Structure 1
Amino acid sequence: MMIIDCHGHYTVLPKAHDEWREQQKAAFKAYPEISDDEIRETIEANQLRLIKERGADMTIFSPRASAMAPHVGDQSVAVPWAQACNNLIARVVDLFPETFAGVCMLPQSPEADMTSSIAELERCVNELGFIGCNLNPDPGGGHFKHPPLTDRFWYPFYEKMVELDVPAMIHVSGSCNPAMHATGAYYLAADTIAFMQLLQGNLFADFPTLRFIIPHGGGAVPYHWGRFRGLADMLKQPSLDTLLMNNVFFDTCVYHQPGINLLADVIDNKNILFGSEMVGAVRGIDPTTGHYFDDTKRYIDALDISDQERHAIFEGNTRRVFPRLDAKLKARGL
């Protein structure tokens, strides 16, 4: 079985990229040339080394999430940034095509509809060979002032996803809200809110093939699985298994064994996708284990499950959720 990591961002970048970013905002408040060897550098010393150390084969790789910051920022700012962030990913893929597959950030901004986003999706899937995207449920950056995912506002975009046969990870970005830390508060809240928004309507009755990944082990959701099943009856809604769990998936970016145990316990096997978000939110060693918080393969490994279960989690669920990756690997005879 292949070990595919479904959650990863290019987090250690050539300086020039981020400096241009700041000057963009400064020329707004009022692009650099990067070499192959610079990118080879940033990736060899970081993700490529850890993949090797940790026994992984592939990582589904997108732009640093907290740097998307669509709230800057109108459509004239977001488009070029989203294009350049995604162009960097396609070069990382180019350079390491057996190791990275591309997921794209969208040029969302607080005031725009999904037109440009539909355009970058097509450019990335159709011309850059990308396999999925990251979808930001709150481009404003901290106050959740966008319409819930059940809103028709988002529909033309899902029509594209469904045309291209590509899933989306629900993923907010950096916070412009002093009351809200990003990787420790905003990210987990959005995971939960996004799940609950879907439990309120019935989106997948309209798009039965639409697939979402809710990162970080679904936020608070599996921990409160009892609460959510119970709210389905409170709201007169269909059960979570029929309403959501053919279309909603959770990664295993939960950085400790007990959390990983609960995830495997209450959530069905087909809904769990191996992911680790390495070199990201939490980079240090765990003082209680001697192993890195984000070396999540270790937690899956220590589970007491069958090969059939381990395989789905490490390879098969992800190839199901990402059809365009499954076909890329089938073509390589894998």
Structure 2
Amino acid sequence: MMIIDCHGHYTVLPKAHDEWREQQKAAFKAGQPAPPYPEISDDEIRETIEANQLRLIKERGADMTIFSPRASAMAPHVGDQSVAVPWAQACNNLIARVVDLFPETFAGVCMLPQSPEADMTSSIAELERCVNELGFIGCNLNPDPGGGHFKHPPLTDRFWYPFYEKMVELDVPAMIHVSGSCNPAMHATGAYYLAADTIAFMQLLQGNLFADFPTLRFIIPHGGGAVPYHWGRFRGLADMLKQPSLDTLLMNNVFFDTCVYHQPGINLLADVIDNKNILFGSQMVGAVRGIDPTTGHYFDDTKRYIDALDISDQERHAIFEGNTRRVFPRLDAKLKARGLLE
């Protein structure tokens, strides 16, 4: 069995990328056109990947990561589409370069040129660019470009439907993912991420999207936010609302990663969420890069937790490889084509 980390971002980047974004943001304020993008060097990228992800991958024993842009640096709220298209384009192009340099190790997933004041029309074009052109396999979907006030329609809205249709056309899932927090009242990677996970879940709970899009597949990170910890709570509200059971309404279409940075959380996730819904990931080099004083191992080396479970090979296969190949059909294919058959 492979070991496929379904959640991981290019977080430790070359100097000149983070340059142009800041100056890019800068010519928007000064009502200026932006300057040319720096032409990065192949081996500048190689360094960052070899020094970071590729090093931990090797030490932790993984096979590939599904790899998208730094999510905290997405920042759709800055500014309008003018800043956010060339900016998403720059970030995905880099994800594309990293796949080309290390295509045995990384599979492409794109962020969207979403902006508060716009619809999904450009995001559709970027997704078709990145799937049909650059060979990506899914996308990251920001349910709140405003940056920390959840001022957007639920995912059950028809605001998003034009986008779900193309997701269905291309056969790619979305990872529901928020970005940086310009809500001064909200820590991004401690509060904001975990809140948007639950809200999105509770949103779908309130509707029935997947009656409309039966093959639409979402991933909700961080082990679904606060959802498994409160699994019984969400089951009783399905009744309170007069809704179908969770297993029927959502859990053919919603999936949870394993970025829960301690054994008891991973224990609870496996106890309460069906094996088919659980995708391995750890987003290494992210929100918690330190050792855990209590376990002598890194907080984000989650594979250590899944290997601590008492689960079968059949279950263990599903978590590390199976679910993710079924959730990402385009990656399954590419792997079958290499003779890597499940």
**TM-score, length-scaled by structure 2:** 0.97
CA shift digits 1:82-115 (9 cap, x unpaired): 0000000000000001000000000000000000
C-alpha distance in 1 between matches for 2:137 and 2:293: 36
C-alpha distance in 2 between matches for 1:302 and 1:165: 33
The Cα shift of 1:289 comes to 0.3
C-alpha distance in 2 between matches for 1:216 and 1:281: 11
CA shift digits 1:204-228 (9 cap, x unpaired): 0000000000000000000000000
Instruction: List aligned pairs for 1:32-43, cutoff 5 A.
Output: 32-43=38-49
The Cα shift of 1:173 comes to 0.2
The Cα shift of 1:262 comes to 0.3
The Cα shift of 1:321 comes to 0.2
C-alpha distance in 2 between matches for 1:121 and 1:281: 26
2:56 matched to 1:63? no
CA shift digits 1:35-90 (9 cap, x unpaired): 00000000000000000000000000000000000001001010000000000000
The Cα shift of 1:3 comes to 0.2
3-state secondary structure, aligned to 2:5:
strand
C-alpha distance in 1 between matches for 2:153 and 2:15: 35
* Corresponding residue of 1:4: 4
The Cα shift of 1:23 comes to 0.3
The Cα shift of 1:9 comes to 0.2
3-state secondary structure, aligned to 1:150:
coil
C-alpha distance in 1 between matches for 2:90 and 2:158: 29
The Cα shift of 1:229 comes to 0.1
Instruction: List aligned pairs for 1:164-203, cutoff 5 A.
Output: 164-203=170-209
* Corresponding residue of 1:232: 238
CA shift digits 1:249-287 (9 cap, x unpaired): 000000000000000000000000000000001100001
C-alpha distance in 2 between matches for 1:28 and 1:96: 34
The Cα shift of 1:331 comes to 0.2
C-alpha distance in 2 between matches for 1:176 and 1:107: 18
C-alpha distance in 2 between matches for 1:150 and 1:309: 31
C-alpha distance in 2 between matches for 1:281 and 1:104: 20
Percent identity between matched residues is 100
C-alpha distance in 2 between matches for 1:269 and 1:37: 40
The Cα shift of 1:237 comes to 0.3
* Corresponding residue of 1:155: 161
RMSD over aligned Cα atoms: 0.3
C-alpha distance in 2 between matches for 1:25 and 1:50: 33
3-state secondary structure, aligned to 2:228:
coil
C-alpha distance in 1 between matches for 2:326 and 2:231: 24
3-state secondary structure, aligned to 1:49:
helix
The Cα shift of 1:33 comes to 1.2
C-alpha distance in 2 between matches for 1:71 and 1:207: 28
C-alpha distance in 2 between matches for 1:38 and 1:226: 49
C-alpha distance in 2 between matches for 1:270 and 1:111: 37
3-state secondary structure, aligned to 1:66:
coil
**TM-score, length-scaled by structure 1:** 0.99
C-alpha distance in 2 between matches for 1:15 and 1:204: 43
The Cα shift of 1:32 comes to 0.8
3-state secondary structure, aligned to 2:289:
coil
3-state secondary structure, aligned to 1:6:
strand
The Cα shift of 1:198 comes to 0.1
> 4+ residue runs of structure 1 moved beyond 4 angstroms?
none
3-state secondary structure, aligned to 1:28:
helix
- Structure 1, unmatched stretches of 5+, are none
C-alpha distance in 2 between matches for 1:161 and 1:243: 19
C-alpha distance in 2 between matches for 1:22 and 1:7: 26
C-alpha distance in 1 between matches for 2:201 and 2:241: 15
3-state secondary structure, aligned to 1:103:
strand
The Cα shift of 1:118 comes to 0.2
C-alpha distance in 1 between matches for 2:143 and 2:303: 28
Number of corresponding residues? 332
C-alpha distance in 2 between matches for 1:76 and 1:244: 36
C-alpha distance in 1 between matches for 2:15 and 2:113: 21
2:27 matched to 1:27? yes
3-state secondary structure, aligned to 1:278:
coil
The Cα shift of 1:129 comes to 0.3
CA shift digits 1:112-144 (9 cap, x unpaired): 000000000000000000000000000000000
